[PDB]
Amino acid sequence: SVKLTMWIMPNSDTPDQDLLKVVKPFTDANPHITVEPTVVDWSAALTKITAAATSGEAPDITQVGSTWTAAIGAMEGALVELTGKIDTSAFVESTLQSAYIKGTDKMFGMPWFTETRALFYRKDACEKAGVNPETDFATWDKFKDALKKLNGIEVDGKKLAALGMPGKNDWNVVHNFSWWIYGAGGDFVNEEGTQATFSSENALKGIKFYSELAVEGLMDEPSLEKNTSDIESAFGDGAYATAFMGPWVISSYTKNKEENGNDLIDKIGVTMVPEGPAGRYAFMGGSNLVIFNSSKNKDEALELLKFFASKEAQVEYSKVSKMLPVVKAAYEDPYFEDSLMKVFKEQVDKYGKHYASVPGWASAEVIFSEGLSKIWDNVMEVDGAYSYDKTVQIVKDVESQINQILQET
Ligand SMILES: OC[C@H]1O[C@@H](O[C@H]2[C@H](O)[C@@H](O)[C@H](O[C@H]3[C@H](O)[C@@H](O)[C@H](O[C@H]4[C@H](O)[C@@H](O)[C@H](O)O[C@@H]4CO)O[C@@H]3CO)O[C@@H]2CO)[C@H](O)[C@@H](O)[C@@H]1O
Numbered sequence: 001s002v003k004l005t006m007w008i009m010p011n012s013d014t015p016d017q018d019l020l021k022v023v024k025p026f027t028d029a030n031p032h033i034t035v036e037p038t039v040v041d042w043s044a045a046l047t048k049i050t051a052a053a054t055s056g057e058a059p060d061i062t063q064v065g066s067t068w069t070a071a072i073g074a075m076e077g078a079l080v081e082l083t084g085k086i087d088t089s090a091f092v093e094s095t096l097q098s099a100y101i102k103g104t105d106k107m108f109g110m111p112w113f114t115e116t117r118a119l120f121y122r123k124d125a126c127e128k129a130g131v132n133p134e135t136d137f138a139t140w141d142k143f144k145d146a147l148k149k150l151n152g153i154e155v156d157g158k159k160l161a162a163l164g165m166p167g168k169n170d171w172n173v174v175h176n177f178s179w180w181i182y183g184a185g186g187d188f189v190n191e192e193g194t195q196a197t198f199s200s201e202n203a204l205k206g207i208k209f210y211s212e213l214a215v216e217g218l219m220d221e222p223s224l225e226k227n228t229s230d231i232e233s234a235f236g237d238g239a240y241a242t243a244f245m246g247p248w249v250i251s252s253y254t255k256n257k258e259e260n261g262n263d264l265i266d267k268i269g270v271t272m273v274p275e276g277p278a279g280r281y282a283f284m285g286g287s288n289l290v291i292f293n294s295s296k297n298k299d300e301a302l303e304l305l306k307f308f309a310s311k312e313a314q315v316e317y318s319k320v321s322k323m324l325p326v327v328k329a330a331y332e333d334p335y336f337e338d339s340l341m342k343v344f345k346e347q348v349d350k351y352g353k354h355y356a357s358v359p360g361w362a363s364a365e366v367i368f369s370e371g372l373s374k375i376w377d378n379v380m381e382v383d384g385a386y387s388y389d390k391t392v393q394i395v396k397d398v399e400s401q402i403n404q405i406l407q408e409t
Helices: 015-029 042-055 066-073 093-099 123-129 140-150 172-184 201-215 228-236 249-260 298-308 311-321 328-332 339-351 361-380 388-406
Strands: 002-008 033-039 061-065 110-115 118-122 153-155 158-163 240-245 268-271 285-291
Touching: 002 015, 002 042, 002 298, 015 033, 015 298, 015 311, 033 298, 042 061, 042 066, 042 361, 061 066, 061 298, 066 093, 066 285, 066 361, 093 110, 093 285, 110 298, 110 311, 110 339, 118 123, 118 339, 123 140, 123 153, 123 240, 140 158, 140 201, 140 240, 172 201, 172 361, 201 361, 201 388, 228 240, 228 249, 268 339, 285 298, 298 311, 311 328, 361 388
Parallel strands: 002 033, 002 061, 158 240
Antiparallel strands: 061 285, 110 285, 118 240, 118 268, 153 158
């Protein structure tokens, strides 16, 4: 028989077991094929995938962050070109842009799932504070005014910080600035994807508006030293009135109720990100699946990728991971009438914006994580009083290095 190996990032509570439950229909129908998943944590995934593409010590298949697909596909001989091998008509068209290398008609990944970051809020905090979450989060200015009412609000003894967000030590550092830059009227690169432009007046206005929510005491500053995992868990413990998070947190908050009696899940709602002066824009992320060119079982691997794109496999993986399907027909399933999931779907569809799918973007994210986190060091005044001018200089320095990276293509 054929033993297909696959790498997956931690997309659900028990990643390997949950993947195996989703692929069981495939292996039942193909008893001569087995699937063996291996988990690779997000922090190491880019290094391990890059090394596997070069060395040939690689699985047949790997999950790849959507923002990294062009980086891997652009490596000569790294991935199987999938152009014309997958029926793209079943996919939500917008999810295909990250599967192609910008500037080419070459498809090197298959969209697997998508995700966006939405605004979670505590319903009990909002009522006690006189905040109507149906209208008071709709714009930047109403949002900031709501945070002032929410900051220091007491909810059953606990004093809550208005907004809680991470600041360091993972890939989300740039993701969490993204829609603030877009909403201000900026972008990270030019239309060609060849020149960094996030030091523009508009991009800086978004960076300034967001970072100075913390300077004004509305965003919890101790949390800016932490990563996404820490802040997701803190919100689940009732530490903040609001937070921007992906849909996967619904899984952990649900488990917290079922296992520990924590009913935070029943006290929260979700709404779209507030509208900025450019209009509403949201982060569009997700993951693709790729076949390594060193695979000795490419026919079987392609069969597995096609199964992962089937309606039922898309629905079942969404139920366990809370990620959004990339296949249109999956949204016909009754599961998608869930009020929370509908917000993420509506947001990504109407307003989701994905980074340019250029080969240098993966390298830029490494620079972003190190560089933009220094904005929070400025805000936290670990080395002198906050200065907007320091933030500007940080952004310009990061932009200069991003430019050198882009010019390697
Ligand atoms: O930039 C690269 C890439 O990023 C993608 O976005 C990723 C984030 O980078 C990543 O931090 C995030 O990780 C989630 C994970 O999906 C959840 O499953 C996980 O849930 C935990 C839970 O907190 C624990 O309580 C429990 O024990 O286990 C599970 C899993 O271990 O929580 C983390 C966040 O802390 O996932 C994002 C989406 O994949 C972008 O989508 C992509 O576009 C980028 O290319």
